Design an enzyme around this catalytic site. Structure first.
Site, short mmCIF file in Angstrom:
data_model
loop_
_atom_site.label_atom_id
_atom_site.label_comp_id
_atom_site.label_asym_id
_atom_site.label_seq_id
_atom_site.Cartn_x
_atom_site.Cartn_y
_atom_site.Cartn_z
N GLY A 30 5.05 26.77 -15.55
CA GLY A 30 5.59 27.47 -16.71
C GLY A 30 6.67 26.67 -17.43
CD1 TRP A 31 7.53 29.45 -21.07
CD2 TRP A 31 8.07 27.59 -22.19
NE1 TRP A 31 6.84 29.46 -22.26
CE2 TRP A 31 7.12 28.31 -22.95
CE3 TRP A 31 8.48 26.33 -22.66
CZ2 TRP A 31 6.64 27.85 -24.18
CZ3 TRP A 31 8.03 25.88 -23.88
CH2 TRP A 31 7.08 26.62 -24.61
CB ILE A 32 11.00 22.72 -18.27
CG1 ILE A 32 9.73 22.40 -17.47
CG2 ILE A 32 12.19 21.93 -17.75
CD1 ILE A 32 9.56 23.04 -16.18
CE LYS A 57 8.56 21.97 -12.26
NZ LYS A 57 8.31 20.55 -11.83
CB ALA A 97 8.55 20.55 -21.63
N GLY A 121 2.90 23.04 -15.49
CA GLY A 121 2.11 23.72 -14.46
C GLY A 121 2.77 24.94 -13.84
CG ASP A 170 3.02 14.58 -8.46
OD1 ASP A 170 1.86 14.10 -8.61
OD2 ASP A 170 3.48 15.47 -9.18
N1 LIG Z 1 15.20 17.01 -15.03
C1 LIG Z 1 14.67 16.98 -16.25
N2 LIG Z 1 15.43 16.51 -17.27
C2 LIG Z 1 14.89 16.46 -18.50
N3 LIG Z 1 13.66 16.81 -18.90
C3 LIG Z 1 12.93 17.26 -17.86
C4 LIG Z 1 13.36 17.38 -16.54
N4 LIG Z 1 12.34 17.88 -15.74
C5 LIG Z 1 11.34 18.05 -16.58
N5 LIG Z 1 11.63 17.70 -17.87
C6 LIG Z 1 10.72 17.72 -19.02
O1 LIG Z 1 9.60 18.53 -18.71
C7 LIG Z 1 8.40 17.72 -18.68
C8 LIG Z 1 7.51 18.19 -17.54
O2 LIG Z 1 8.24 18.10 -16.31
P1 LIG Z 1 7.55 18.30 -14.87
O3 LIG Z 1 8.47 18.57 -13.74
O4 LIG Z 1 6.63 17.08 -14.63
O5 LIG Z 1 6.59 19.56 -15.06
P2 LIG Z 1 5.06 19.83 -14.71
O6 LIG Z 1 4.19 19.31 -15.87
O7 LIG Z 1 4.93 21.29 -14.76
O8 LIG Z 1 4.62 19.43 -13.22
P3 LIG Z 1 4.78 20.49 -11.87
O9 LIG Z 1 5.45 21.81 -12.36
O10 LIG Z 1 5.93 19.99 -11.12
S1 LIG Z 1 3.48 20.72 -10.49
C9 LIG Z 1 8.89 16.29 -18.57
O11 LIG Z 1 7.98 15.32 -19.07
C10 LIG Z 1 10.17 16.33 -19.40
O12 LIG Z 1 9.89 16.19 -20.79
MG LIG Z 2 5.03 19.16 -9.50
MG LIG Z 3 4.88 16.55 -13.39
#
Ligand SMILES: Nc1ncnc2c1ncn2[C@@H]1O[C@H](COP(=O)(O)OP(=O)(O)OP(O)(O)=S)[C@@H](O)[C@H]1O
Ligand SMILES: [Mg+2]
Ligand SMILES: [Mg+2]
Ligand SMILES: [Zn+2]
Length: 322
Positions: free
Chosen positions: A81-83, A99, A76, A79, A194
């Site tokens: 970038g890429w995960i 991340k 995904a 905020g 959060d």
């Molecule tokens: N540990 C994880 N295992 C599996 N999927 C994950 C994991 N972390 C994130 N994801 C996936 O990535 C999506 C977004 O993850 P978040 O950490 O909430 O990213 P975000 O939208 O950028 O908020 P920020 O970066 O922390 S301020 C989640 O809804 C999942 O689909």
């Molecule tokens: Mg965050």
């Molecule tokens: Mg989040």
């Protein structure tokens, strides 16, 4: 003959950010957009604040991070970038998640970011995502960037739209599983900070909190960021506290169960008058109002106290539903 499919393939997304989802990490404004004049660039600088942006993945399939993590692709985009999805060479090739830590910064800024978040490796609770490591790698331009390494969490977030709100009993049962994780954090002098439906993952077995980026020490002011509609009004004056986390529990329950009014894309403060759900379950409505009280001293003193009242409310909701 039936095919041998790699199950990781179905878990990954195309590594392109659609134009409607491109925003500047610094000022929040839309960036990388196509106009009636020119096509939107996948990387460049924000025309309003001058911050660099890139919607391109910074880790490619087959890349090896810190000689340990074999990158498979993207899960995904958020905020920061890429995960990324990767395979952990120290733990049998188990799929893990990477991340980024900071949106921008030099070597020293990256090192400082990694060091300040290292304590998360010590956070151990069955309902909180496990952080395995903090590693450094070079981005697509050759500058070193830091990454958090975490457990791969199955399922999807609890984020529900106006048409798919959870029944009250279901939402309460979910938060009763989350409240002990908050009590655990508070017991070691930490605030989750959060809590919102999108940061709660629903798996085939349990609930799990993800996104530990806001986790901070009680009464510290280093991180005051939050979502309007979830964040406690007094955070600027007190910094994160047990009271600010209790407020987010109240807002989270409301966002999961009620058709809350929204203004400029955010939930408005307080609870709507004559809401059918709150009129149906009175003790539930009373608990929510206590949890979101503008005076933090009026809210539940501890997560354990809130859990005790919430258990009582669940019994009443279940009895009323008959
Ligand atoms: N540990 C994880 N295992 C599996 N999927 C994950 C994991 N972390 C994130 N994801 C996936 O990535 C999506 C977004 O993850 P978040 O950490 O909430 O990213 P975000 O939208 O950028 O908020 P920020 O970066 O922390 S301020 C989640 O809804 C999942 O689909
Ligand atoms: Mg965050
Ligand atoms: Mg989040
Ligand atoms: Zn900007």
């Amino acid at each position: 003959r039936a095919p041998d499919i790699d199950p990781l393939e179905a878990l990954m997304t195309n590594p392109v950010v659609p134009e409607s989802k491109r925003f500047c990490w610094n000022c929040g404004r839309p960036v990388g957009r196509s106009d009636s004049e020119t096509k939107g660039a996948s990387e460049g600088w924000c025309p309003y604040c001058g911050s660099p942006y890139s919607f391109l993945p910074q880790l490619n399939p087959g890349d090896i991070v810190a000689g340990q993590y074999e990158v498979k692709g993207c899960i995904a985009h958020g905020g920061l970038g890429w995960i990324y999805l990767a395979l952990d060479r120290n733990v049998n090739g188990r799929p893990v998640v990477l991340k980024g830590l900071v949106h921008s910064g030099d070597a020293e800024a990256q090192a400082m970011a990694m060091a300040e978040r290292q304590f998360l490796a010590e956070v151990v609770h069955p309902s909180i995502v496990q952080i395995f490591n903090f590693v450094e790698h070079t981005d697509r331009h050759g500058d070193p960037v830091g990454y958090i390494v975490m457990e791969y969490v199955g399922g999807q977030s609890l984020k529900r739209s106006k048409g798919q709100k959870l029944p009250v009993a279901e939402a309460i049962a979910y938060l009763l599983e989350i409240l002990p994780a908050l009590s655990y954090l508070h017991s070691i002098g930490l605030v989750y900070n959060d809590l919102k439906p999108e940061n709660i993952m629903l798996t085939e077995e349990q609930l799990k909190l993800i996104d530990l980026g806001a986790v901070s020490r009680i009464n510290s002011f280093g991180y005051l960021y939050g979502t309007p509609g979830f964040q406690a009004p007094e955070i600027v004056r007190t910094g994160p506290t047990v009271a600010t986390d209790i407020y987010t529990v109240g807002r989270t329950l409301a966002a999961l169960t009620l058709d809350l009014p929204t203004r400029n894309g955010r939930y408005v403060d307080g609870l709507p008058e004559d809401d059918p759900v709150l009129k149906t379950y009175d003790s539930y409505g009373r608990l929510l109002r206590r949890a979101i009280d503008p005076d933090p001293r009026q809210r539940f003193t501890t997560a354990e106290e809130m859990s005790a009242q919430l258990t009582g409310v669940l019994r009443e909701v279940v009895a009323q539903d008959t």
